[PDB]
Amino acid sequence: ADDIVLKAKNGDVKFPHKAHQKAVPDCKKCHEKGPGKIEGFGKEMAHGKGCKGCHEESKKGPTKCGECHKK
């Protein structure tokens, strides 16, 4: 499958799967979540535990605006 880009108005956000599969061997951090996670994602989740928050706790991954968002 292909990577996906989230069309954030301030700048597209790329999600590179290969890096995550390698760096987050606990697959259940993202997969086999109960229903609702597709509908549930948004800016609140992205800037929280959905993206940025995991990067902050992991001590690795982009945490600055322009490291995720890029026109």
Ligand code: HEC
């Ligand atoms: C969130 C940070 C994830 C983690 C950690 C893992 N996966 Fe994932 N996976 C995630 C998304 C959002 C998607 C769809 C969009 C994309 O970029 O591909 C996927 C996709 C997969 C797939 C399909 C890949 C393909 O056919 O190319 C597989 C087989 C898959 N995910 C498995 C997988 C495993 C085994 C993981 C742990 C090692 C893992 N993923 C981590 C989100 C996230």
Ligand code: HEC
């Ligand atoms: C943990 C559960 C994570 C979640 C959820 C998301 N990310 Fe992540 N990401 C995580 C780690 C530990 C790393 C380091 C990987 C590395 O090898 O440096 C990353 C990395 C990224 C990157 C950069 C990858 C690279 O090639 O350097 C990007 C661009 C990124 N992450 C984006 C991103 C987005 C948009 C997410 C939400 C949709 C997201 N990540 C979730 C851990 C985790």
Ligand code: HEC
């Ligand atoms: C990745 C780890 C991010 C960092 C760091 C920042 N943002 Fe972000 N943001 C990210 C994603 C994946 C999304 C999209 C949510 C979705 O619905 O898919 C967003 C969203 C925004 C938005 C709203 C965009 C829109 O609704 O169209 C804004 C205005 C925004 N982000 C700005 C922003 C700023 C100023 C940041 C640094 C302070 C920042 N983001 C960090 C991913 C990530």
Ligand SMILES: C[C@H](CCC(=O)O)[C@H]1CC[C@H]2[C@@H]3CC[C@@H]4C[C@H](O)CC[C@]4(C)[C@H]3C[C@H](O)[C@]12C
């Ligand atoms: C469920 C995990 C982990 C975050 C959490 O604990 O909620 C999150 C992390 C990344 C999230 C995906 C980001 C890309 C997509 C954003 C869409 O708008 C809704 C579906 C997708 C495919 C999201 C589904 C789900 O919301 C995921 C896989």
